[PDB]
Design a protein around this nucleic acid. Sequence first.
RNA 1: GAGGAGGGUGGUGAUGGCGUGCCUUUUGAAGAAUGAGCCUGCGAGUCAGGGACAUGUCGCAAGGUUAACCCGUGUGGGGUA
RNA 2: AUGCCGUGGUGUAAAGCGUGGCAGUGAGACGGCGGGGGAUAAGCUCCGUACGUCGAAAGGGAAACAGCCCAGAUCGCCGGC
RNA 3: CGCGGCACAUCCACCUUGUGGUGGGUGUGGGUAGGGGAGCGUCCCUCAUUCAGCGAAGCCACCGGGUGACCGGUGGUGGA
Lengths: 59, 124, 146, 56, 100, 22, 77
Amino acid sequence: SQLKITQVRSTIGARWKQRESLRTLGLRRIRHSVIREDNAATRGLIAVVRHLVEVEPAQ
Amino acid sequence: ARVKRAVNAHKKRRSILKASRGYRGQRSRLYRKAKEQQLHSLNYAYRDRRARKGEFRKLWIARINAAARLNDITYNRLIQGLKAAGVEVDRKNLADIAISDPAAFTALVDVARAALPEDVNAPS
Amino acid sequence: PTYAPKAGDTTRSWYVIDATDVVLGRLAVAAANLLRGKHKPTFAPNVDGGDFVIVINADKVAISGDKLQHKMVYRHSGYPGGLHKRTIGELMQRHPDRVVEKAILGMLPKNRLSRQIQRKLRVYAGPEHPHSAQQPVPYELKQVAQ
Amino acid sequence: STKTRGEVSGGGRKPYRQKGTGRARQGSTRAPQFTGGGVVHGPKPRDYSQRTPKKM
Amino acid sequence: TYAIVKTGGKQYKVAVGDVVKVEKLESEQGEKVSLPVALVVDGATVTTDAKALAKVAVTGEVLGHTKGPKIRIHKFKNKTGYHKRQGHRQQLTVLKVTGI
Amino acid sequence: AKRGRKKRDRKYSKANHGKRPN
Amino acid sequence: GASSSRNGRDSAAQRLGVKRYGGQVVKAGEILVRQRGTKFHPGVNVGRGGDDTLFAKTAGAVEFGIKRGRKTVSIVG
RNA sequence: GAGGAGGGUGGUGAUGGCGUGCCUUUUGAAGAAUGAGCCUGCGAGUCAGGGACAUGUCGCAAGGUUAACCCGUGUGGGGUA
RNA sequence: AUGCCGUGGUGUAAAGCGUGGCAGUGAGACGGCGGGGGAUAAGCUCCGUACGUCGAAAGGGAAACAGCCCAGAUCGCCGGC
RNA sequence: CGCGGCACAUCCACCUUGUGGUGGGUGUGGGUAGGGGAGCGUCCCUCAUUCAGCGAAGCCACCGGGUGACCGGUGGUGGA
Ligand SMILES: [Mg+2]
Ligand SMILES: [Mg+2]
Ligand SMILES: [Mg+2]
Ligand SMILES: [Mg+2]
Ligand SMILES: [Mg+2]
Ligand SMILES: [Mg+2]
Ligand SMILES: [Mg+2]
Ligand SMILES: [Mg+2]
Ligand SMILES: [Mg+2]
Ligand SMILES: [Mg+2]
Ligand SMILES: [Mg+2]
Ligand SMILES: [Mg+2]
Ligand SMILES: [Mg+2]
Ligand SMILES: [Mg+2]
Ligand SMILES: [Mg+2]
Ligand SMILES: [Mg+2]
Ligand SMILES: [Mg+2]
Ligand SMILES: [Mg+2]
Ligand SMILES: [Mg+2]
Ligand SMILES: [Mg+2]
Ligand SMILES: [Mg+2]
Ligand SMILES: [Mg+2]
Ligand SMILES: [Mg+2]
Ligand SMILES: [Mg+2]
Ligand SMILES: [Mg+2]
Ligand SMILES: [Mg+2]
Ligand SMILES: [Mg+2]
Ligand SMILES: [Mg+2]
Ligand SMILES: [Mg+2]
Ligand SMILES: [Mg+2]
Ligand SMILES: [Mg+2]
Ligand SMILES: [Mg+2]
Ligand SMILES: [Mg+2]
Ligand SMILES: [Mg+2]
Ligand SMILES: [Mg+2]
Ligand SMILES: [Mg+2]
Ligand SMILES: [Mg+2]
Ligand SMILES: [Mg+2]
Ligand SMILES: [Mg+2]
């Protein structure tokens, strides 16, 4: 449908494919939210970065 | 155009030595040893304008935790009961009622205790 | 402006703690809070608030069987080889008031004002205390239910 | 005009040997840190006339 | 009676006639402000309820805009040569409480 | 060699997470 | 110390390997697979070269394949 | 204001927490690495050249500009090599 | 398995590239993972790693503790998470 | 995260729409080596103006000011 991603941990000590994957989702700082579509490219961004974020099925 | 340096140079020495009154030893009398101390005395003021925001919270909690336990409840469950009832009083004023108005603090205990869940150990 | 107590506002009282079956850890903790005034809502860490504590019956404190044999008390005199050691079990025969008082004084903060706090503490061995001129109220151990 | 350290009078020898004295090594008595020594990057005689074009 | 009033992201215990220094409210000298409360003690009643406190407000009266204490900052790290000097005056507002 | 072993065994705390300098 | 520098020497690495992969548009003359020997063989519109270099003869896309065991490099024109 | 209480400047700071000088040089120094006993004074990217490259700006613009020198009390006017 | 090259969608301001002015650096250290030397010894040494941190990073935790864990200080606040 | 101050970049609307000013969003502002940009202070000359034996410079003390280098006020000493 349409997902809601909230960042929980920092980018300090994260790798290049994890910092730049939060940049494409549109996240900036801890406890920042964003609303994105559930296409097959969003949950490929989430699967790389899933230890730093908190996804939920929210409108 | 030869410039004697002394009128420019004494401007930054009179104000370092006015900010060093009350220091002991050479650290209030000499410029080279009171410029070293002013480098520490402003990092210490910077470090402790931000530390005291935790230091007063560390004192307000210990006065609530002392005053919650005159009314047989821990501090652990008083903060839970005052968020489950919608009482957004901060810990500065909640620790000032406990000293200045004790009968108005027993009422906030009986509001937080009654709004607390019945089995506090059972999962939500 | 938060409350900082004046001189002449700290009102002191007199407690007496029996120790007939109480362990040494529960009693030294409850005497350390009661001398410093942590139980009072007007607490300040730079002010000697807090009441007097009279510990009677210190020869009957609850110490286990394996601690009257194997727990040591060390003093050092400064001279070389001057390390001495005495067990708790051979201090509970001669000076039983020192065992309770050492456990309290390791739980106070290590600063200058604790040397004025420890002037409010009287530890005795028998069930009799000389401070009947005052009126010490008894103090039982309580744990706040949660 | 001022005098540089090669135009101030004297200062031709080395005042004391380099190692063993406990003083700093100095090399000349008219070096620019000495009172009485030469002036480093001091003024010289100059002509400040510029070359502005005629139409300007 | 007293009440704990919210202003400027912070809270202040006020009474009728107190003088409280708060953050810079956009108001000139002499105007009236209305501020939300978080607790109202009226003797032995504490009123303690979020639905019933939104109908109660504290009426203020501005005495004038003042300045705060001068804060001198000189940051410094040890063997590098970093210096940064900065000053600050926090703009404040003196506020008379005439309401509750 | 007590110093070399006691400095090495203090990395097994919950805060260091099995890693310390040297 | 035993002077065991009996073997301490190497040549220079020659930068061999595949240089233009599959589905990649090339120009006329572009070197595709520089190699020793014919690890890869010339197919359609691919010449071999003097030191078995497998360049390109015609612009197009590069595709790899098999032609009786020997694997080939070809260009679709 | 006679005194006390209230409030506010200035001086001292019982007591609590936090807190490993400065510079140079180093992978890293409070370091038991270097340098300074203290104060006042002096003490280190300057100048010459139609030099070289690159820029900011001003005049003139298919043209721009003179050098030596000459004439003027001057910073002005001539001077095409 | 990863990594690498190409291409088609989608996403993201301070990404990439060409050409000039001015640089500094070219003694690195520790930690995780893969290896050589060494006795599968070293706070040892030599490499790999769109790996991290220190260097140049303060703040909280590991008693103290450049390199470990959490987190990147524009300034104020006697506010919350 | 909340409330208030400052700076840089970018975008959207105005004013002689780039020499650029005013207002509103979002973002950004640890920092050595080093690069870039903008300022305070002492002295000297020139132009304009204005103080000074009814007390200039310099020095000392106090009370205030600015984001910083720093500045102003009043008084004491002093003599161009
Ligand atoms: Mg003092
Ligand atoms: Mg905080
Ligand atoms: Mg401590
Ligand atoms: Mg000579
Ligand atoms: Mg010589
Ligand atoms: Mg001379
Ligand atoms: Mg001429
Ligand atoms: Mg360093
Ligand atoms: Mg080879
Ligand atoms: Mg051949
Ligand atoms: Mg102290
Ligand atoms: Mg070394
Ligand atoms: Mg030293
Ligand atoms: Mg020393
Ligand atoms: Mg040396
Ligand atoms: Mg020395
Ligand atoms: Mg010297
Ligand atoms: Mg031009
Ligand atoms: Mg080299
Ligand atoms: Mg090298
Ligand atoms: Mg290396
Ligand atoms: Mg090493
Ligand atoms: Mg490594
Ligand atoms: Mg290894
Ligand atoms: Mg080495
Ligand atoms: Mg870094
Ligand atoms: Mg270095
Ligand atoms: Mg750190
Ligand atoms: Mg730390
Ligand atoms: Mg610590
Ligand atoms: Mg909490
Ligand atoms: Mg930041
Ligand atoms: Mg910066
Ligand atoms: Mg720099
Ligand atoms: Mg006079
Ligand atoms: Mg003068
Ligand atoms: Mg002044
Ligand atoms: Mg004056
Ligand atoms: Mg004067």
